[PDB]
Design a binder for this molecule. Sequence first.
Ligand SMILES: CN(C)[C@@H]1C(O)=C(C(N)=O)C(=O)[C@@]2(O)C(O)=C3C(=O)c4c(cc5ccc(CN6CC(F)C6)cc5c4O)C[C@H]3C[C@@H]12
Ligand SMILES: CN(C)[C@@H]1C(O)=C(C(N)=O)C(=O)[C@@]2(O)C(O)=C3C(=O)c4c(cc5ccc(CN6CC(F)C6)cc5c4O)C[C@H]3C[C@@H]12
Ligand SMILES: C=C[C@]1(C)C[C@@H](OC(=O)CSCCN(CC)CC)[C@]2(C)[C@H](C)CC[C@]3(CCC(=O)[C@H]32)[C@@H](C)[C@@H]1O
Ligand SMILES: [K+]
Ligand SMILES: [K+]
Ligand SMILES: [K+]
Ligand SMILES: [K+]
Ligand SMILES: [K+]
Ligand SMILES: [K+]
Ligand SMILES: [K+]
Ligand SMILES: [K+]
Ligand SMILES: [K+]
Ligand SMILES: [K+]
Ligand SMILES: [Mg+2]
Ligand SMILES: [Mg+2]
Ligand SMILES: [Mg+2]
Ligand SMILES: [Mg+2]
Ligand SMILES: [Mg+2]
Ligand SMILES: [Mg+2]
Ligand SMILES: [Mg+2]
Ligand SMILES: [Mg+2]
Ligand SMILES: [Mg+2]
Ligand SMILES: [Mg+2]
Ligand SMILES: [Mg+2]
Ligand SMILES: [Mg+2]
Ligand SMILES: [Mg+2]
Ligand SMILES: [Mg+2]
Ligand SMILES: [Mg+2]
Ligand SMILES: [Mg+2]
Ligand SMILES: [Mg+2]
Ligand SMILES: [Mg+2]
Ligand SMILES: [Mg+2]
Ligand SMILES: [Mg+2]
Ligand SMILES: [Mg+2]
Ligand SMILES: [Mg+2]
Ligand SMILES: [Mg+2]
Ligand SMILES: [Mg+2]
Ligand SMILES: [Mg+2]
Ligand SMILES: [Mg+2]
Ligand SMILES: [Mg+2]
Ligand SMILES: [Mg+2]
Ligand SMILES: [Mg+2]
Ligand SMILES: [Mg+2]
Ligand SMILES: [Zn+2]
Lengths: 142, 38, 172, 207
Amino acid sequence: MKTFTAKPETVKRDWYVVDATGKTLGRLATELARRLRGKHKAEYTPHVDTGDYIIVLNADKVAVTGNKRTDKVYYHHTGHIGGIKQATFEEMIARRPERVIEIAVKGMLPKGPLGRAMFRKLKVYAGNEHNHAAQQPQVLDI
Amino acid sequence: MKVRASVKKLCRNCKIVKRDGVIRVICSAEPKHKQRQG
Amino acid sequence: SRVAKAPVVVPAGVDVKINGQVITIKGKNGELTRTLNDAVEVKTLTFGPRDGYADGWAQAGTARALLNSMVIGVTEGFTKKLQLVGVGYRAAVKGNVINLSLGFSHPVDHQLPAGITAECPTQTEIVLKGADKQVIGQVAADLRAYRRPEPYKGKGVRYADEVVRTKEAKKK
Amino acid sequence: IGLVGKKVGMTRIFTEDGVSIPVTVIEVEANRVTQVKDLANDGYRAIQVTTGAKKANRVTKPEAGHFAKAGVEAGRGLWEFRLAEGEEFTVGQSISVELFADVKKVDVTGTSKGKGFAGTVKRWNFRTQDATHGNSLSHRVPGSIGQNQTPGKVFKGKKMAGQMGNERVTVQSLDVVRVDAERNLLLVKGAVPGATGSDLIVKPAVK
RNA sequence: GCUGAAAGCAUCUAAGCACGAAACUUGCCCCGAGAUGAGUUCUCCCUGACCCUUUAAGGGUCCUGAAGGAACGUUGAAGAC
RNA sequence: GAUGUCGGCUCAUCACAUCCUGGGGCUGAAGUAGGUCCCAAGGGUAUGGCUGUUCGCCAUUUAAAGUGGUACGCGAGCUGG
RNA sequence: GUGAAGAGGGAAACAACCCAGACCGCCAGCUAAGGUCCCAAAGUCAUGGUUAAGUGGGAAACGAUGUGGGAAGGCCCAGACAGCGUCGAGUCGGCCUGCGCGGAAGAU
Ligand SMILES: CN(C)[C@@H]1C(O)=C(C(N)=O)C(=O)[C@@]2(O)C(O)=C3C(=O)c4c(cc5ccc(CN6CC(F)C6)cc5c4O)C[C@H]3C[C@@H]12
Ligand SMILES: CN(C)[C@@H]1C(O)=C(C(N)=O)C(=O)[C@@]2(O)C(O)=C3C(=O)c4c(cc5ccc(CN6CC(F)C6)cc5c4O)C[C@H]3C[C@@H]12
Ligand SMILES: C=C[C@]1(C)C[C@@H](OC(=O)CSCCN(CC)CC)[C@]2(C)[C@H](C)CC[C@]3(CCC(=O)[C@H]32)[C@@H](C)[C@@H]1O
Ligand SMILES: [K+]
Ligand SMILES: [K+]
Ligand SMILES: [K+]
Ligand SMILES: [K+]
Ligand SMILES: [K+]
Ligand SMILES: [K+]
Ligand SMILES: [K+]
Ligand SMILES: [K+]
Ligand SMILES: [K+]
Ligand SMILES: [K+]
Ligand SMILES: [Mg+2]
Ligand SMILES: [Mg+2]
Ligand SMILES: [Mg+2]
Ligand SMILES: [Mg+2]
Ligand SMILES: [Mg+2]
Ligand SMILES: [Mg+2]
Ligand SMILES: [Mg+2]
Ligand SMILES: [Mg+2]
Ligand SMILES: [Mg+2]
Ligand SMILES: [Mg+2]
Ligand SMILES: [Mg+2]
Ligand SMILES: [Mg+2]
Ligand SMILES: [Mg+2]
Ligand SMILES: [Mg+2]
Ligand SMILES: [Mg+2]
Ligand SMILES: [Mg+2]
Ligand SMILES: [Mg+2]
Ligand SMILES: [Mg+2]
Ligand SMILES: [Mg+2]
Ligand SMILES: [Mg+2]
Ligand SMILES: [Mg+2]
Ligand SMILES: [Mg+2]
Ligand SMILES: [Mg+2]
Ligand SMILES: [Mg+2]
Ligand SMILES: [Mg+2]
Ligand SMILES: [Mg+2]
Ligand SMILES: [Mg+2]
Ligand SMILES: [Mg+2]
Ligand SMILES: [Mg+2]
Ligand SMILES: [Mg+2]
Ligand SMILES: [Zn+2]
């Protein structure tokens, strides 16, 4: 027989809710990336999104070690000459705290259309409330 | 402030102090003896 | 080490709360609160490294010294004296606002924090008072900063005990 | 808040001490509040206003229902002004130019006159090259637009020919010369953006 | 700089606290939801039958044609089109 | 089996080893005005005489008339000394 | 020795370095160099240490109470060491060695 392949039509994706409070950024992000990709399922298929939907609460309370809170720098370029911009981790937390988790996870997901599709299943919130009661997310301790 | 690679006690009133990862010489007697490694 | 080892005598009329990692001493001259580094156990008060803390003796010695000051603070309390040197340099206290004339085109109008109190014995002296040794230190530094004592004549705001070193100009 | 008016034109005011003040005359008819936005419903605090009049046949049913909810006659457009904390308004309230009675300076926003496709000389104040001394077909042309292989491209934001004017412009900190509630007029010192007859937004000066 | 141990002292620093520049983040002006993460608010409009099969976000017929749009015309201190 | 060359003109863009403006330590810093070092790249940063000149000298300005990288930036953009 | 005239795996990419020599087919298995948190296959493996510099992941003379280990020493309850006779336990400064720190400015 040919090896099994997951089918995008029939894949079951569960909903989970994770609390980022006090969790180390990168060690949370690897577990998120793993589960968004579906690497935790026996039906894992490289060309199919078999992963789960994950709500992350309290993104503003994510932890980092060392002097990273002040010294970790996020760079981006605007596309305009001289348009190199930067923000420290602490500035990112103050202004756009959900982006810290989102940026970390995006860099750990595959690049290309499927990786972008996998990222859409991550729902990051700054505080302790989400609006997805209807999806009945299960608590997941990462 | 003298900014040098070699910072040293220049008299008995000079003290070596490390502040924020920088070796400095502070002197109670002589302001000319104030140094920062750099 | 030696600082940390020595416990602090807490007098009668002075009351010490300990709740989690918080000290909040009562008493006549005032009231004061702090939270210490998590390497310190405050057992008089007695201070010591907690286990799993390499800085614990360093942290205990500072804790000791701060609480010694806090228990001084709410008894005899702290006083700081400043002197104005220079023609036309006056000071005057008015509520919680010291008014310094210091040879500027504008009057300086420095406001004391919540519980520091000033008196001008003469116009050329300020006498600060409070329970917090850090805050009275900071207020005194801020007042000195308006016109720090200058090296040719010694003019400006000085600490009354300060010995301002003087020099003469370039020889012609 | 500010008000919406119309650029009537420019004139002057002679003072008794022999100063001629150039003025823009702005007709500021009653601005009628058509909607109040609040934090609960809209996520921000603002008034929407209309002014002037539109012919019934040019008022669409969606537009007409919006005006009818407010209980105001249709005006020529809708504009929003953000509210500060103490500012409160009610739907249907008319706001007149007397708003500016004690305002010393205003910012005036309009659509600048349209120059169409403009060259670099006009649009960006580029210098012309030689009219003579051998110049071949290159009198008002832009010159070089980049370097060489490094970087081997033109940078974004390069100043080049293109549409000029016909855009939103604010002129800040114009003196209010006269507020005439009777005639619905605001006189401001100096020029403001746009052609005679164009819409102007007038706000108390932010600076 | 303050307070302050490690290091009985000293020490702006290790814990803790305060100042500090046209640089930085804002504040000012303009663009801006293709922000595909395509958001929000207000208002308006459409309230008919039936047949068929590969029963399905299925296909067609008759009746109906709204709000609004476009087109055309007269045009504009809008504009190469 | 061709990667157009000095200088000018037009238009730039980056670095910072900073010319001006901003902050600061030391001074053989009285003041005024300097010297030197540290921080700082936001913006600003001559016109002429002579010469193909770049440069330089000179005249007269300026807060200042920065130093470099960009095929010693830029001839499918101009010039052609 | 390899490339030339040599594919495969590793060294991000990278003839000439490391592993290794492709007769063809397989949706079997074991290994090499190199690896095992996610991109990305495999240890968020075990035990004992070191480092706080993101050192690791560019680094020289030289500078420094950074911090771990070691071998001697001088002085010390006949009271040292510091600060003010007081004072009441260690203190002092060289050597060797592990890992770090400064020295460290460039152009889309
Ligand atoms: C080619 N390869 C062996 C290495 C490589 O793959 C890289 C890379 N980034 O992938 C390199 O950077 C490399 O090509 C390279 O450029 C190196 C060096 O430049 C280099 C290296 C180590 C050195 C050690 C000491 C000295 C001291 N110098 C010698 C004398 F002149 C004073 C210089 C070094 C040096 O220049 C690493 C290699 C690695 C290369
Ligand atoms: C990390 N990365 C930036 C480079 C890299 O990827 C490699 C690699 N092989 O893939 C390296 O080898 C690298 O990590 C490395 O180790 C380097 C060096 O060791 C290196 C390099 C250049 C040097 C130039 C001069 C000198 C000597 N002078 C006197 C001393 F004070 C400095 C040493 C060098 C050196 O050690 C290249 C980098 C490249 C790195
Ligand atoms: C003909 C070649 C030219 C147009 C000019 C050339 O300049 C010379 O070769 C100077 S010597 C020849 C002068 N002349 C004939 C007597 C012909 C231009 C010169 C400046 C270089 C020195 C050699 C390389 C070059 C390309 C880039 C460049 O700078 C050119 C060639 C590939 C180019 O095609
Ligand atoms: K939208
Ligand atoms: K340049
Ligand atoms: K100076
Ligand atoms: K600058
Ligand atoms: K060339
Ligand atoms: K040329
Ligand atoms: K070309
Ligand atoms: K041409
Ligand atoms: K061979
Ligand atoms: K690093
Ligand atoms: Mg890939
Ligand atoms: Mg500092
Ligand atoms: Mg026009
Ligand atoms: Mg000209
Ligand atoms: Mg010709
Ligand atoms: Mg011509
Ligand atoms: Mg490219
Ligand atoms: Mg002390
Ligand atoms: Mg300015
Ligand atoms: Mg060819
Ligand atoms: Mg610099
Ligand atoms: Mg910048
Ligand atoms: Mg700014
Ligand atoms: Mg000249
Ligand atoms: Mg060139
Ligand atoms: Mg150049
Ligand atoms: Mg030509
Ligand atoms: Mg060219
Ligand atoms: Mg010629
Ligand atoms: Mg050959
Ligand atoms: Mg090979
Ligand atoms: Mg290979
Ligand atoms: Mg390499
Ligand atoms: Mg490398
Ligand atoms: Mg490869
Ligand atoms: Mg195996
Ligand atoms: Mg894996
Ligand atoms: Mg482990
Ligand atoms: Mg490194
Ligand atoms: Mg080093
Ligand atoms: Zn000295």
